[PDB]
Write an enzyme that holds these catalytic residues in place. Structure first.
Site, PDB file in Angstrom:
ATOM      1  N   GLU A  35      11.714 -51.144  57.221  1.00  0.00           N
ATOM      2  CA  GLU A  35      12.968 -50.716  57.837  1.00  0.00           C
ATOM      3  C   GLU A  35      13.672 -49.668  56.980  1.00  0.00           C
ATOM      4  O   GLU A  35      14.135 -48.653  57.491  1.00  0.00           O
ATOM      5  CB  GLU A  35      13.913 -51.911  58.030  1.00  0.00           C
ATOM      6  CG  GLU A  35      13.522 -52.900  59.141  1.00  0.00           C
ATOM      7  CD  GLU A  35      13.617 -52.320  60.533  1.00  0.00           C
ATOM      8  OE1 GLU A  35      14.065 -51.168  60.678  1.00  0.00           O
ATOM      9  OE2 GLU A  35      13.211 -53.012  61.489  1.00  0.00           O
ATOM     10  N   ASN A  46      20.098 -43.978  66.415  1.00  0.00           N
ATOM     11  CA  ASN A  46      19.247 -44.305  67.559  1.00  0.00           C
ATOM     12  C   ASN A  46      19.587 -43.419  68.740  1.00  0.00           C
ATOM     13  O   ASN A  46      20.670 -42.834  68.807  1.00  0.00           O
ATOM     14  CB  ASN A  46      19.414 -45.774  67.946  1.00  0.00           C
ATOM     15  CG  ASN A  46      19.159 -46.711  66.787  1.00  0.00           C
ATOM     16  OD1 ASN A  46      20.010 -47.532  66.436  1.00  0.00           O
ATOM     17  ND2 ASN A  46      17.987 -46.589  66.180  1.00  0.00           N
ATOM     18  N   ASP A  48      20.392 -44.172  71.668  1.00  0.00           N
ATOM     19  CA  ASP A  48      21.503 -44.691  72.464  1.00  0.00           C
ATOM     20  C   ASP A  48      22.870 -44.392  71.852  1.00  0.00           C
ATOM     21  O   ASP A  48      23.898 -44.702  72.448  1.00  0.00           O
ATOM     22  CB  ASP A  48      21.326 -46.192  72.768  1.00  0.00           C
ATOM     23  CG  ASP A  48      21.554 -47.082  71.558  1.00  0.00           C
ATOM     24  OD1 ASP A  48      21.623 -46.569  70.426  1.00  0.00           O
ATOM     25  OD2 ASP A  48      21.651 -48.315  71.744  1.00  0.00           O
ATOM     26  N   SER A  50      23.871 -45.596  68.922  1.00  0.00           N
ATOM     27  CA  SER A  50      24.098 -46.575  67.858  1.00  0.00           C
ATOM     28  C   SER A  50      23.411 -46.113  66.575  1.00  0.00           C
ATOM     29  O   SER A  50      22.621 -45.159  66.596  1.00  0.00           O
ATOM     30  CB  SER A  50      23.570 -47.957  68.257  1.00  0.00           C
ATOM     31  OG  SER A  50      22.155 -47.939  68.351  1.00  0.00           O
ATOM     32  N   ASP A  52      21.556 -47.679  62.828  1.00  0.00           N
ATOM     33  CA  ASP A  52      21.037 -48.783  62.018  1.00  0.00           C
ATOM     34  C   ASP A  52      21.452 -48.578  60.570  1.00  0.00           C
ATOM     35  O   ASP A  52      21.352 -47.459  60.040  1.00  0.00           O
ATOM     36  CB  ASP A  52      19.511 -48.813  62.040  1.00  0.00           C
ATOM     37  CG  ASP A  52      18.938 -49.097  63.411  1.00  0.00           C
ATOM     38  OD1 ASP A  52      19.631 -49.712  64.250  1.00  0.00           O
ATOM     39  OD2 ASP A  52      17.767 -48.725  63.635  1.00  0.00           O
ATOM     40  N   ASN A  59      21.900 -52.918  63.490  1.00  0.00           N
ATOM     41  CA  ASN A  59      22.384 -51.972  64.472  1.00  0.00           C
ATOM     42  C   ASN A  59      23.819 -52.167  64.924  1.00  0.00           C
ATOM     43  O   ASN A  59      24.243 -53.252  65.139  1.00  0.00           O
ATOM     44  CB  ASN A  59      21.458 -52.104  65.672  1.00  0.00           C
ATOM     45  CG  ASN A  59      21.666 -51.051  66.666  1.00  0.00           C
ATOM     46  OD1 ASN A  59      21.162 -49.987  66.511  1.00  0.00           O
ATOM     47  ND2 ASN A  59      22.422 -51.337  67.682  1.00  0.00           N
TER      48      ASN A  59
END
Length: 129
Positions: A35, A46, A48, A50, A52, A59
């Protein structure tokens, strides 16, 4: 902060992640490797909108507030910036809530794609724990 593998394993173990929800410590170390590359300051946007955050790439759509993810929740009750600290306490507490939420560690797509079904114990091999 960029953790060493065994350093992170020890920190995660102290914070209660070994065997949390039945996920051995190696799962959590593997997840962090893929990650964030063990970097607490990692951030990734991301599609969308959002973002992380942190060593486990938690998120903002659900788990933390960053003030720029419309329609999102903040279920961990923290600013997303808290997830970037050299102290992994916030990330661990939030991860405990994520992994308890129904889908287990499948919440981390990198865990599902890169750790699940592999020899995850290798990630803690040689570590003084």
């Amino acid at each position: 902060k960029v953790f060493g593998r065994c350093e992170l394993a020890a920190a995660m173990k102290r914070h209660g992640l070994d065997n949390y929800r039945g996920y051995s410590l190696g799962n959590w170390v593997c997840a962090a490797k893929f990650e964030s590359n063990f970097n607490t300051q990692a951030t990734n946007r991301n599609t969308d909108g959002s973002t992380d955050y942190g060593i486990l790439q938690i998120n903002s759509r659900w788990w933390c507030n960053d003030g720029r993810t419309p329609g999102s929740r903040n279920l961990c009750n923290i600013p997303c910036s808290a997830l970037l600290s050299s102290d992994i306490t916030a990330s661990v507490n939030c991860a405990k809530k994520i992994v308890s939420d129904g889908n287990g560690m499948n919440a981390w797509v990198a865990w599902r794609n890169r750790c699940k079904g592999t020899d995850v114990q290798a990630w803690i091999r040689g570590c003084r724990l």
